[PDB]
């Protein structure tokens, strides 16, 4: 009982501190900045060959190679520049929920309800792609495992617990705990010394990879958090809640800077990413289209329609050249 | 140029990949996928004697292959990994009949599954296991349905009942009452997009495979008829 009163007092004090910190508003500060304009990105490619719904994809470091995964149980390495199946990998378990591309471009990972995301070698001397390491130890289903280095990999499973592994030994080296609900997505920092995660408890947390402990928490969403991406300078980030609204957060100020929501949109979000310049914010809704938001003004910059079914994943190349979006119709469409 | 050799190798690799992928797609279309469900310790892992997310089964009937999955490793929370089965042939639902206390939870879970947005267009083959146990409990009379369901006091056996030889009127009435209670949720509002196929099975039943075969044939035929607009 006393602990409850202490927690309530601490929460009230934190809220008062944030309220005192707030002085102005982003729209008022940036009101004097002109609109970007109605952008009309037109499809430049269409990638075909995946039988079932597509859940996740990842760009390579060179902005020319990327990987996709679908429920049918196949891993395909495409080539956006020239549409070709560079490699095809059939998974042991037909169920998969995420895919990753090592920054070195020599390894990929993918996992799902099997509670494991394994390691595939793409620089085989024998020439045949084979699984090198499978990491076991997670309790719930694996929601997302993103690469950190050729030997370090991060993960977030269905048991409300992220994990930093070491493939050469395949042993959990640090455990991130403290999340009430399920963990959906994470986004590493460009400095690769931190990473923020979203969970199905209307909250997001910031960790320290070396020290392994939550550093801060943010709560401004009514429903679960599906996607989380990092601002390229590592001083802000935005999330897409299922409540049909996207918000922008700051680490230094530690408040919800701005929100993106209109009356005409009432569907849930599934993916989020930031354009290289940082002025454009992309959101993939549940009504079979993606929306482009003027990040610093929170006004509809434009629409990106032309998907038969739900748009699950989304991403922007490293150089901010091409945008790739996968959907439930089993098609990947690249936008200039 | 001397760089188009890489293009030739790329074309050869792409051709091989497509050639294999065609066979893979053919097989994947050929196979039929089913999702198993039901409360724990309810004959879920033993509905089929196996005479043919984590757990999968492979049984073939009349040169037709069926793929049934048993999600039995994940946590209790369900509203997120359930969506990964929105394109299955049908969902198998198994619910025990002699546990009046968990029966209400079974009704609520089934209703939520029926109303789920992303599963709005999937039919379910409903099962009702432990009929012998229900008969034993009814004959014993220690408990009573009325102590849980007040509406049962004003229920009567349907005129279309097909009782098994010697089936007591009391046990038959209870069975069909539970069946109607299940069916009411589905028939409430579905718009004809999907339906249910209630059954009366037991732990000793060995013909469940035939029943699911007939049910899946019927539903696929109904889908083929819905296309072409009847």
């Amino acid at each position, epitope marked *: 009982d006393q602990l409850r009163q202490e927690a309530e007092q601490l929460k009230n004090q934190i809220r008062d501190a944030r309220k005192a910190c707030a002085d102005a508003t982003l729209s008022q500060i940036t009101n004097n900045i002109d609109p970007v304009g109605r952008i009309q990105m037109r499809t430049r490619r269409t990638l075909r060959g995946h039988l079932a719904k597509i859940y996740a994809m990842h760009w390579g470091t060179d902005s020319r190679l990327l990987v996709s995964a679908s429920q049918d149980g196949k891993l395909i390495i495409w080539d956006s520049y020239t549409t070709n199946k560079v490699h095809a990998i059939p998974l042991r378990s037909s169920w998969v929920m995420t895919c990753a591309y090592a920054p070195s471009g020599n390894y990929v990972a993918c996992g799902g309800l099997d509670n494991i995301c394994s390691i595939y070698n793409l620089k085989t001397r024998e020439g045949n792609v084979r699984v090198s390491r499978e990491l076991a130890g997670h309790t719930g289903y694996l929601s997302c495992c993103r690469f950190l280095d050729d030997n370090q990999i991060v993960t977030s499973s269905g048991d409300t617990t992220c994990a930093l592994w070491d493939i050469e030994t395949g042993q959990q080296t640090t455990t991130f705990t403290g999340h009430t609900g399920d963990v959906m997505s994470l986004s590493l920092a460009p400095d690769t010394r931190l990473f923020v995660s979203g969970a199905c*408890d209307a909250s997001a947390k910031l960790w320290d990879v070396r020290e392994g402990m939550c550093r801060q928490t943010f709560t401004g969403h*009514e429903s679960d958090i599906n996607a989380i991406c990092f601002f390229p300078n590592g001083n802000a980030f935005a999330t897409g809640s*299922d409540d*049909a609204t996207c918000r922008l957060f700051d680490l230094r100020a530690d408040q919800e800077l701005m929100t993106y929501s209109h009356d005409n949109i009432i569907c849930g979000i599934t993916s989020v990413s930031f354009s290289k310049s940082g002025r454009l914010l992309l959101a993939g809704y549940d009504d079979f289209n993606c929306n482009v938001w003027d990040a610093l003004k929170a006004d509809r910059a434009g629409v990106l329609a032309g998907h038969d079914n739900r748009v699950s994943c989304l991403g922007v190349t490293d150089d901010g050249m091409a945008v790739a979006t996968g959907s439930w119709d089993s098609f990947l469409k690249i936008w200039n | 140029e001397d760089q188009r050799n890489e293009e030739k190798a790329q074309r050869e690799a792409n051709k091989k990949i497509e050639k294999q992928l065609q066979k893979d797609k053919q097989v994947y279309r050929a196979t039929h996928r089913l999702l198993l469900l039901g409360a724990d310790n309810s004959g879920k892992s033993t509905i089929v004697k196996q005479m043919r997310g984590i757990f999968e089964t492979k049984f073939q009937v009349d040169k037709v292959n069926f793929h049934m999955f048993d999600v039995g490793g994940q946590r*209790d*929370e369900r*509203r997120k990994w359930i969506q990964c089965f929105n394109d299955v042939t049908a969902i198998i639902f198994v619910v025990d009949s002699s546990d009046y206390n968990r029966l*209400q939870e079974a009704l609520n879970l089934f209703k939520s599954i029926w*109303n789920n*947005r992303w599963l709005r267009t999937i039919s379910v083959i409903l099962f009702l296991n432990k009929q012998d146990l229900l008969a034993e409990k009814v004959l014993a009379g220690k408990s009573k349905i009325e102590d849980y369901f007040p509406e049962f006091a004003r229920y009567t056996t349907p005129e279309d009942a097909t009782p098994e030889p010697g089936e007591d009127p009391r046990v038959t009435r209870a069975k069909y009452f539970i069946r109607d209670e299940f069916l009411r949720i589905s028939t409430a509002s579905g718009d004809g997009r999907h339906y249910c196929y209630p059954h009366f099975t037991c732990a000793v039943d060995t013909e469940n495979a035939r029943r699911i075969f007939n049910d899946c044939r019927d539903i696929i035929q109904r889908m083929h008829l819905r296309q072409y607009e009847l």
Partner: nanobody
Amino acid sequence: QVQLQESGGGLVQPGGSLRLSCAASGFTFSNYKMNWVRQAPGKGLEWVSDISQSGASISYTGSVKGRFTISRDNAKNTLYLQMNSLKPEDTAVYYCARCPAPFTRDCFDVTSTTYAYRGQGTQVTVSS
């Protein structure tokens, strides 16, 4: 930010009246479907009642049919559940659970001591 405080409740003789309230804040109250869920001592959770967006659709469990009333008020961000004629086995922790999806009526919110948007509780016991 999501908070659900459940006031009311107390010791009452068998067959007496009562009233329970679930104060909520941090979200648009009118865009969610509310439920009451109880956990009898030495047992798991279980559904009790529910209510639709504007209060049109209502439902109840078997044992409370006709003995409990659920009332909602969106203009104040509060939700009541009037209780009348309670029996000895009515004693249990009561919660005010909201499932996440707005503008839908389908959800799984009786998780085994793991749900996130569930009120902390409001103890009510019946004694002689």
